[PDB]
Amino acid sequence: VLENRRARHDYEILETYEAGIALKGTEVKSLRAGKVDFTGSFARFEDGELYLENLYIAPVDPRRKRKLLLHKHELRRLLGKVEQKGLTLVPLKIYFNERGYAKVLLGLARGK
Ligand SMILES: [K+]
């Protein structure tokens, strides 16, 4: 389990959400090795899809924008809360579930 220690220590975390991550190439192997950097990463909607931006996965652009996969119920919870004054949707942790799906726990963060 890869954790964003900075987010937890410097921000107050409000609601959280879980999503899958669409990985490409060797990205999956790098994540298993724990070669990730959360610095400056955030999630934002673009053309009907939620994307995780600026997440670094050590060696394809190591910081390419990656599509997040949301189930309808989670999308419904999120819609309308992403763009709110002073809040940022940030990745809190990345892990793989039993079936091998890469997952990211997102949280609305407010300046602490
Ligand atoms: K800190």
Curated annotation (Swiss-Prot):
Write out the annotated subcellular location: Cytoplasm
One Gene Ontology term of the molecular function aspect? rRNA binding
Keyword Membrane applies:
no
- Entry GO terms, CC: cytosol
Q: Which UniProt keywords apply?
A: Cytoplasm, RNA-binding, rRNA-binding
Q: Give one GO biological process term.
A: trans-translation
The family this protein is said to belong to: Belongs to the SmpB family.
- Function of the molecule: Required for rescue of stalled ribosomes mediated by trans-translation. Binds to tmRNA (also known as SsrA and 10Sa), required for stable association of tmRNA with ribosomes, probably by bridging tmRNA to 50S subunit. tmRNA and SmpB together mimic tRNA shape, replacing the anticodon stem-loop with SmpB. tmRNA is encoded by the ssrA gene; the 2 termini fold to resemble tRNA(Ala) and it encodes a 'tag peptide', a short internal open reading frame. During trans-translation Ala-aminoacylated tmRNA acts like a tRNA, entering the A-site of stalled ribosomes, displacing the stalled mRNA.
Additional info?
A: Athough the Valle et al., electron microscopy paper indicates this protein came from T.thermophilus, its sequence maps to A.aeolicus. The Fu et al., paper maps the coordinates of T.thermophilus to E.coli.
* Subunit annotation: Binds tmRNA. Binds to both the 50S and 30S ribosomal subunits via rRNA contacts, bridges tmRNA binding to stalled ribosomes.
Please state what the protein is called. SsrA-binding protein
Q: From what organism does this protein derive?
A: Thermus thermophilus (strain ATCC 27634 / DSM 579 / HB8)
